[PDB]
Every structure is written in C-alpha cells, then in structure tokens.
Design a protein around this nucleic acid. Structure first.
Length: 485
DNA sequence: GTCCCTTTATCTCTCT
DNA sequence: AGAGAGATAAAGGGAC
C-alpha cells in the first residue's frame, strides 16, 4: 500500500534538481533498492547544492550499489572532511563511495589515511586506489597490517602491495600471498614477480590457491611450461581457467586437433573458462558450416570475452557475409578483439546508415570496427561525422583515420573539443591535429599538447610547435611527458 | 538490506 | 600495429 509513495517518489526524481531518466531509476532501484531510491529523493537538494556540489551522474553512481543510502549519508557527511582535512578531490571521494559498502571504505579511509600516508609512506593516490573497490576497508586494514611484514620479511615493494590490494577482495589476496609466497618461490620454483602478477587480479586468492595446487600436476603432465601456467592464472578469474584447462586440454587437443599453445592462449584471458568451453562446443560448426579454420577460431577465442565473440560470430557471420557482403576474413578481423560481440552487433546494425548518408565504404567500416571499443568508435563516427566534416572543415577519410585506433571514440571527442583552441589560439593546422589523434593515445596526446601550449613550460620553449607535434605524433603524452622532464 | 569476495565483459592507453 | 597493462562496470554468489 506504499507502492503509491514509491512510484510518486520515482516519478518526482524525474524532475529538479536531478532530472533522472528511466534507466537510471532502474539502475538504482536494481542495485541500490527501494531505500536507495527514497534516500536519493530526500537529499536531492542537499547533495546537489553547496558545499557538496555533486552532479546527477555522481549521485546515481553512489546510490546504485548495495548500501546506496548509507554511502549517500556518509558522502554527505565526509566529502568536506576528506577534501579539506585530507586533500582529496571530490572525484576521489565519489570513486570510493561508488561501490558496495561505501560507508565502510569512506570511514576507514578517513581513519587510516594519515597513518598510511605518513607512517607507511603511501600517497593518497594509492590509498584511494585501494579503497576504491568492494570491501575497500578490509583491503585498507589488511595493508596497514601486512605492509611491513610483506615488504620487510617477504621482500616486496610497496608498489606491489598496493597493486595486490587494489582489487576487490584485496584483503584475501594479501593474506594469501603472505601464506603461499614461500611455498611457491621455492617449492614449485617461481619468481615473486610471477606470484605478484597472479595475486594482483580480483580473485587473486583463488588463483593463488589453485596454482599452489596444480602447478606440480599440470606442469609435469600436459607438458605446460610453468611460465605458461602463470600466464594462465595471472589473469581474470584464473582459478576457473586453470581447472577448465585441467579438464579440456587433452580433449580439444586430441578431439579437436588443438595444440597446447592455443588452449593455453585461450585460457590466458579474462573469462577463459568460457572461452575454452565455448570453443569446445563450437570449434566444429565454425569450421564446418562457416568454413573458418582452427587457427581463426583460436584467434577469435584468444581475446577477452572469447565466448561472446564466438557466439556472435556463429550467429552473425552468414547474415553479415550474405547480406552486408563481408568476407569471413573481415568478420574474423572485427571479432578478434575485446568486446568483439559488441563490435559485430554494431556493425551489422550500422553498415547501412554509415555507408549511405556518410559515403563510408564497407572497408572503412570494418577498419573502424577492427579495434577494441570498435562499437564505441562506430557510434561516435555515426554521431560526429556530420558535425565534424561540416562545421569544422574535415574530410570523412580523416575522421576515419582518427576513429581507426583503440580509443577511436575518445580521440574523436577530444578532437571535436580541442580543434578550435589548437588551430586558432595556438596556430596549428588540422592536418597536424589529425596526425596526432590518429594514433592510440589520441585523447591524452591532444590534451598534453594543448596543456603544453596554453601554460607553456618556460624551459620547454626550446622546442617548436612543430617539434611538439612531431612528438605527440611519435609517442603521444608519454613522449611529451619525457620532455617536461 | 548491507557488506564482502569472485568471475566475466568491455574499453582505453602504453611502449616500443 | 600488437602484445601488454590499466582501468570501468555488471553480474554472480555467500555471509549476517
């Protein structure tokens, strides 16, 4: 009988000061719950207004987790203390809240930040890193606790300790390293380095126990070099890829004619369990009715979310080749990255619109879709290729060159925003800008140049605008950063 | 309902 | 340009 108030509330959030859309109320109501939704509406005016000055997106980002209400009340209370007593940016405060049990991680940060920063020479960037996950305060307490005994007695660096703690379940990972480090750097014969690689992913603990167990087994059985097994486990949810390999290695090996190199090459990714399993269902069909080769199959499988890519290829190769006229070779190009499934769906959807009101060739389209975030780049091209070419004096071929990299989208937006100030204000030519953006690292290379030009370092005017440009072209921000030094 | 841990998908940047 | 590193986020599930 309260459903009336609930809906009235979730109808009133649709206006000021928050103006939320369906999918956001859905996001909150989902992960945050009825009580997150209600709290949001209570503090809409208090969260938005000074001194907190939060944004709608920020407020959703907090609310939409187990704890939403708690984390909202906590953030309201602590943001000022964290920023003014502890020199944190509101951004960082938000990143820490935006997880399950915000309240815990915030409070624990406020408490431990001094003693970790002072007494344990950590930087607030690092502490923020560790708090910014689920169970952040477990992580925090376990770092406070174990950092000495881990650095001194086990011989680690604090950067490694930080790296292991900056996953969800960092607590468990720290303790598990503390336990098993000796029983691996000696008993199966591994670098720390390797162990550290293993423990620095979520489920690092699981991956650690699992290896501790199977490294003697799997490495003197199926013939895996132990380097290969580390490879496998020093990845997302390794555990599962380790067992899944223990099962499916001989099979796919003998029953599917797969070399251990490729099985290993598949499991050596996030969700490798799913990649191995799905390759075991679908390796056939794919090579039978689709003509694809085992090589190309392994290929599609050896990026992250292999299973999505595989299944989307099995479902979309024919309609793609048959209707939109693409080669199997091209389809494999588009699938052979992370988010492949997405890349494919977006192509199939967009090849039409793109190759028409934009005059884009299918080859340009497949070029765009054949990198990570391919779908992002596509959508961004579709949105901007009008805005750009026209009211900014570019050509489709250039827009294509800017999209045709990882971060295609970041690059296209950054260009949209910075073209004016760089061309005019600092006297650069569009060919230059385009040169720079047309690499992976576009966004930051642009930003790093624009910065270098608007607040030009006094002992950096040794170099010419065109030398800078040559350098952002060469190695983006990394290279313009190796100058300001 | 709040808090913690695991696994899986996706996206972006770096370094040569 | 491709392998590596890094980072963002959702979807499980267990515990009290």
């Amino acid at each position: 009988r309260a459903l009336e108030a609930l809906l009235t509330v979730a109808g009133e959030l649709r206006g000021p000061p928050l103006q939320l859309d369906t999918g956001q109320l859905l996001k909150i109501a989902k992960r945050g719950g009825v009580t997150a939704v209600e709290a949001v509406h209570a503090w809409r005016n208090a969260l938005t207004g000074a001194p907190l000055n939060l944004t709608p997106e920020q407020v959703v980002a907090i609310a939409s987790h187990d704890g939403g209400k708690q984390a909202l009340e906590t953030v309201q209370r602590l943001l000022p203390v964290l920023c003014q007593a502890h020199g944190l940016t509101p951004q960082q405060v938000v990143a820490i809240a935006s997880h399950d049990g915000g309240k815990q991680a915030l409070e624990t940060v406020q408490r431990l930040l001094p003693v970790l920063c002072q007494a344990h020479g950590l930087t607030p960037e690092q502490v923020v890193a560790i708090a910014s996950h689920d169970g952040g305060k477990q992580a925090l307490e376990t770092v406070q606790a174990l950092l000495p005994v881990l650095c001194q007695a086990h011989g680690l660096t604090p950067e490694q300790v930080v790296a292991i703690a900056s996953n969800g379940g960092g607590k468990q990972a720290l303790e598990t390293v503390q336990r098993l480090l000796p029983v691996l750097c000696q008993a199966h014969g591994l670098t720390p380095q390797q162990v550290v690689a293993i423990a620095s992913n979520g489920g690092g603990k699981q991956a650690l126990e699992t290896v501790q167990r199977l490294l003697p087994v799997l490495c003197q059985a199926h013939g895996l070099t132990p380097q290969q097994v580390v490879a496998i486990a020093s990845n997302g949810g390794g555990k599962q890829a380790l067992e899944t390999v223990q099962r499916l290695l001989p099979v796919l090996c003998q029953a599917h004619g797969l070399t251990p190199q490729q099985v290993v090459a598949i499991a050596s990714n996030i969700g490798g369990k799913q990649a191995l399993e799905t390759v075991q269902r679908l390796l056939p069909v794919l090579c039978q009715a689709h003509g694809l080769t085992p090589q190309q199959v392994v290929a599609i499988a050896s990026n992250g979310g292999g299973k999505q890519a595989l299944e989307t290829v099995q479902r979309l190769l024919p309609v793609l080749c048959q209707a939109h006229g693409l080669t199997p070779q091209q389809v494999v190009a588009i699938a052979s990255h992370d988010g492949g499934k997405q890349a494919l769906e977006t192509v199939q959807r967009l090849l039409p619109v793109l190759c028409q009101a934009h005059g884009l060739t299918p080859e340009q389209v497949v070029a765009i879709a054949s990198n990570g975030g391919g779908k992002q780049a596509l959508e961004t091209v579709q949105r901007l290729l009008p805005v750009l070419c026209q009211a900014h004096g570019l050509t489709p071929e250039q827009v294509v060159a800017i999209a045709s990299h990882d971060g295609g989208k970041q690059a296209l937006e950054t260009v949209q925003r910075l073209l004016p100030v760089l061309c005019q204000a600092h006297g650069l030519t569009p060919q230059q800008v385009v040169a720079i953006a047309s690499n992976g690292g576009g966004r930051p290379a642009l930003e790093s140049i624009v910065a270098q030009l608007s607040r030009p370092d006094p002992a950096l005017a040794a170099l010419t605008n065109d030398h800078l440009v040559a350098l952002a072209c060469l190695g983006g921000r990394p290279a313009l950063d190796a100058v300001k030094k």
